[PDB]
Structure 1
Amino acid sequence: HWGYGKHNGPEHWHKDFPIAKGERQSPVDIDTHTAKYDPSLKPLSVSYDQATSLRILNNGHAFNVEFDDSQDKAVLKGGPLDGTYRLIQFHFHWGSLDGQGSEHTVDKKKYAAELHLVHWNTKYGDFGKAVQQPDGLAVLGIFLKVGSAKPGLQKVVDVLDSIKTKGKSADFTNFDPRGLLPESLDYWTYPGSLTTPPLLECVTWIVLKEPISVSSEQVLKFRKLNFNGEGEPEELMVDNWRPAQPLKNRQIKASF
């Protein structure tokens, strides 16, 4: 099936998922000089104080920290959004080297990794229904640069040994996602898609301008994960990012 290798990577996805060459695919390069400030954009509202994390899962392409989304516990609203979007999971994309790893780029600059906090529009009832709608998901993207350690990320780094291979999961309760947010919530926003198959065009992207910094030891642990399942040849989970896609007929808006 699809993956990030030379024979099943991003350049091959369109064969099974034709929407890969669609009109609103992600990620994209954010040209900071061309993005336009939109004074009508409302401040973003990130309400994670009641977040209830449950489990962490290695799904063969990344690791997802899953949350209880059966009630409005952790939600994203405001900004370009109409309505309430519930946090369901977060995951990262990262590189084999500190100079690459993010999906979105800023003036062609690549960051070491990119965090995606995934939320679905409650007016659609469940995640599966939401991904079938143009305004079904809101994904908050946060860049990671290598420098100082991020204390709020250490609990995630420490449990990775327990989910080294595809299909492994571990209990992961009481994790506070507020510890992964930068100081500023200034952002860029545009309509796009999931960045892994099925590449559905159901995402309002909100990418924060301020990156968070993580230590080299922290990202090294990400790179020790495996794409393969236990007992299979070891393939390190690195470079699980899709490159920038054509912007086509879209405008990126800035909140600042």
Structure 2
Amino acid sequence: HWGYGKHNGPEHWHKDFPIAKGERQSPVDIDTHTAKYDPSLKPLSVSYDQATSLRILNNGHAFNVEFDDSQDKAVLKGGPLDGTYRLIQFHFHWGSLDGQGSEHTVDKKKYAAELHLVHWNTKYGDFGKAVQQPDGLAVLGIFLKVGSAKPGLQKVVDVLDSIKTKGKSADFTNFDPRGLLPESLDYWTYPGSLTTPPLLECVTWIVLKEPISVSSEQVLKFRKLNFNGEGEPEELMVDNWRPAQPLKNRQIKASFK
């Protein structure tokens, strides 16, 4: 099965997912000097006040905090997006050490971790149909750097001991994802893909420029999770990030002048 190790990591994925070498793969390095301000971008609207979180799951690659997406409870609109995109889940990618962990990089800088808030375009009815479309998904990416603690992350941190191994889940109701945002919504945007198999080229990426700060203790608890299932030899869930992929025939646009 695909993973992040030497024998099943990103350099192997193309053998079962040939789109891994495609024209629109993610993540990418964001060259800030090359990225151009785009006056055609509309204001970005993150509308999470009615979000309904349900559950947190260790899926063997990361942990997903899942939302009720049966209605427009928590949506992303505006910016580069045409129409309404509905929040389905968020997850993170992180490193074994503070100096790596993000998927996107900024002028080749790697952050300690990266948060992905995943949304699907409601014109396509369901996530499964959305991932058949070139504008099916919008992922809001947020970098994490290590410094002061992020208070709105602590509830996530504290439940991780209950989902240590692959396949474990726990109730995770009444979690407010607004507490994971930075102050500014300045962003870069480009067309890309899922960063894990099946690597589908369906994503409008919106990557915020301002990182959030989390404490060393918070990210250390991410690193206590396990890739393995219960009873199996312990493999710490660390370095679950894909490196930057070729930009090819793309441009990164900036929301800010």
Please list the CA deviations of residues 138-168 of structure 1 after superposition, one character each: whole Å capped at 9, or x if unmatched.
0000000000000000000000000000000
Three-state SS of the structure 2 residue aligned to 1:218 is helix
Three-state SS of the structure 2 residue aligned to 1:185 is coil
Shift of 1:43: 1.3
Please list the CA deviations of residues 121-143 of structure 1 after superposition, one character each: whole Å capped at 9, or x if unmatched.
00000001001110000000000
Question: For structure 1, which runs of at least 5 residues remain unmatched after alignment?
Answer: none
Shift of 1:190: 0.1
Shift of 1:72: 0.4
Shift of 1:39: 1.1
Cα separation, 2, equivalents of 1:185 and 1:201? 24
What is residue 210 of structure 2 aligned with on the other side?
210
Please list the CA deviations of residues 190-224 of structure 1 after superposition, one character each: whole Å capped at 9, or x if unmatched.
00000000000000000000000000000000000
What is the number of equivalent residue pairs in this alignment? 256
What is residue 92 of structure 2 aligned with on the other side?
92
What is residue 149 of structure 2 aligned with on the other side?
149
Cα separation, 1, equivalents of 2:221 and 2:209? 25
Shift of 1:40: 1.3
Cα separation, 2, equivalents of 1:32 and 1:106? 7
Please list the CA deviations of residues 171-195 of structure 1 after superposition, one character each: whole Å capped at 9, or x if unmatched.
0000000000000000000000000
Shift of 1:42: 1.1
Three-state SS of the structure 2 residue aligned to 1:87 is strand
Shift of 1:99: 0.2
Three-state SS of the structure 2 residue aligned to 1:143 is strand
What is residue 191 of structure 2 aligned with on the other side?
191
Cα separation, 2, equivalents of 1:161 and 1:138? 30
Aligned pairs for 1:38-187 within 5 A: 38-187=38-187
TM-score (norm 2): 0.99
Shift of 1:254: 0.2
Please list the CA deviations of residues 28-59 of structure 1 after superposition, one character each: whole Å capped at 9, or x if unmatched.
00000000000111111000000000000000
Three-state SS of the structure 2 residue aligned to 1:119 is strand
Three-state SS of the structure 2 residue aligned to 1:244 is coil
Please list the CA deviations of residues 97-130 of structure 1 after superposition, one character each: whole Å capped at 9, or x if unmatched.
0000000000000000000000000000000100
Name segments (4+ residues, structure 1) moved above 2 Å. none
Question: For structure 2, which runs of at least 5 residues remain unmatched after alignment?
Answer: none
Three-state SS of the structure 1 residue aligned to 2:158 is helix
Three-state SS of the structure 1 residue aligned to 2:129 is helix
Cα separation, 2, equivalents of 1:135 and 1:182? 26
Cα separation, 1, equivalents of 2:198 and 2:228? 20
TM-score (norm 1): 1.00
